[PDB]
Amino acid sequence: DDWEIPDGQITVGQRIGSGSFGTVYKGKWHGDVAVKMLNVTAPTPQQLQAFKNEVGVLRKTRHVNILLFMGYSTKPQLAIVTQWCEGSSLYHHLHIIETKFEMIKLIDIARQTAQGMDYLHAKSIIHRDLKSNNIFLHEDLTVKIGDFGLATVKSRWGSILWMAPEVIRMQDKNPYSFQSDVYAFGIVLYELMTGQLPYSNINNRDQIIFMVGRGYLSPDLSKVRSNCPKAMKRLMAECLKKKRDERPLFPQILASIELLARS
Amino acid sequence: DDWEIPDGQITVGQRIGSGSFGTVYKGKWHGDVAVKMLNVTAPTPQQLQAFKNEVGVLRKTRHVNILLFMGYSTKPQLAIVTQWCEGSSLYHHLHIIETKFEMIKLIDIARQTAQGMDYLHAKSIIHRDLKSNNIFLHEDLTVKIGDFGGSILWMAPEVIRMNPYSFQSDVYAFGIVLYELMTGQLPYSNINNRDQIIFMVGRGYLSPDLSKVRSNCPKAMKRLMAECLKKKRDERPLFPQILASIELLARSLP
Ligand SMILES: CN(c1ccc(F)c(NC(=O)c2cccc(OC(C)(C)C#N)c2Cl)c1)c1ccc2nc(NC(=O)C3CC3)sc2n1
Ligand SMILES: CN(c1ccc(F)c(NC(=O)c2cccc(OC(C)(C)C#N)c2Cl)c1)c1ccc2nc(NC(=O)C3CC3)sc2n1
DSSP states (O other), X not given: OOOXXXXXXXXXXXXXXXXXXXXXXXXXXXXXXXXXXXXXXXXXXXXXHHHHHHHHHHTTOOOTTBOOEEEEXXXXXXXXXXXXXOXXXXXXXXXXXXXXXXXXXXXXXXXXXXXHHHHHHHTTOOOSOOOGGXXXXXXXXXXXXXXXXXXXXXXXXOXXXXXXXXXXXXXXXXXXXXXXXHHHHHHHHHHHHHXXXXXXXXXXXXXXXXXXXXXXXXXXXXXXXXXXXHHHHHHHHHHTOSSGGXXXXXXXXXXXXXXXXXX | OOOBOOTTOSXXXXXXXXXXXXXXXXXXXXXXXXXXXXXXXXXXXXXXXXXXXXXXXXXXXXXXXXXXXXXXXXXXXXXXXEEOOOEEEHHIIIIISOOOOOHHHHHHHHHHHHHXXXXXXXXXXXXXXXXXXXXXXXXXXXXEEOOOOOOGGGOOHHHHTOOOOOHHHHHHHHHHHHHHHHHSSOSXXXXXXXXXXXXXXXXXXXXXXXXXXXXXXXXXXHHHHHHHTOSSGGGSOOHHHHHHHHHHHHHSOO
């Protein structure tokens, strides 16, 4: 049961973006593919472990709303091959080209993101960076969740606007939980329903960090659209609760959106 | 890895289709899924093996033009879960509701179908039953090859006239699908006798009427179709060539 792709089969075309954590290219392998590969000559143990982990997580996922993993390649140079996505991120849609989705679609995008996050959490995978930049709107109608580090456009301020207060505070070595993912989703729901990023009235990054952290600052829920249903606004408020253990988990979140999805 | 879905996780919903070996339902498992369940709930050794073998193949595939396997269940019943396809099969579009696609889109369907088959072959997988109803036009956009079930109209003569399966026998089936796409019809529509179709195709007396292809069908395509439908097994191209051939053809067009 292997996923290694023999060398010389992958063609690498355009370079889409580069981090210190890898370089993404558009490529060809049995069709269009994205190739994330370490541009280095000799992978260090930490990088090789980073690679083994990403592959380990990606091959546990087979769900329509998660970016399809297709193979890896160690032979010439460490590389991960996924499906090539088409269109743009949810971030780009809401905050750059400013596309205007009907309410029926906004709610759909929520639903699908919720489906995917329910799936990850069922397999006990915590994303730790769910945000509209990492939600690709494939063919303009299927949510693909991934980690698109710099392959898609950057947020205003890592990425602070989606961090739950317990994460911002950084109380201990691991403040991440299914519930921190839920809060992040909560912000994505804010984005969908408002069309905007939170805290747009504040020009200082450290102040946002400080205040969200102490519970002094929270998303202004009055900026949601008239036609956004009360169920959705209520669910949004529950997800954004400042107390981790007061937040709902995705099975219920999914169930809530599914219910308001009819009618 | 392990793809066993725990018990009482999939809510089985509407029944979609039943047929001898299996029954398939629309279900809910982190969104819509399709659940295919074994009928007789005291399964026999050979049926159990069939299940093993399907899941064995299904989990070898990760490609956008292949139906997405998601998991299996053994408790209480044997069941295989895939993604749920919204839309219609290629068979249903072309022969039941008779969708009129524009040519550019028909060529794209062939591209994608060949794209998937190319993948499958690369992993030493022979489909053995490629046909229009095993091609689902997901969301009216993305082809998903699967096996959603003899299928005589798509069998190459060497198969018809009895392991005769090969990449080439898969290619012949694809040749028939191209015919379907380009004519919007099934082959041998003027013959109503199955036994005679079997005998005649096997003897080489019968082969698809390529004059029935649409007027705007490119000559390059009509030729590829003739090559994929060659009676002799070894004269048929493999999918890398087919895909390169459709590639070139589709660029002088868009
Ligand atoms: C950046 N990118 C890409 C390519 C290969 C990869 F392996 C990854 N990796 C991940 O996304 C990733 C990393 C860590 C964990 C992880 O799993 C969980 C389950 C936590 C999640 N989510 C993942 Cl999934 C990323 C890609 C991939 C496709 C792609 N398509 C693009 N299309 C375009 O840019 C054109 C329209 C403009 S960019 C792109 N980047
Ligand atoms: C019938 N079906 C479905 C469900 C579960 C399954 F496991 C399979 N299996 C296969 O298709 C299959 C079987 C044997 C081998 C095999 O692999 C090869 C390599 C030959 C291939 N390809 C496979 Cl892949 C099939 C499904 C699945 C989705 C689905 N969606 C539907 N939607 C609708 O009918 C309504 C919108 C109109 S029906 C359906 N059936």
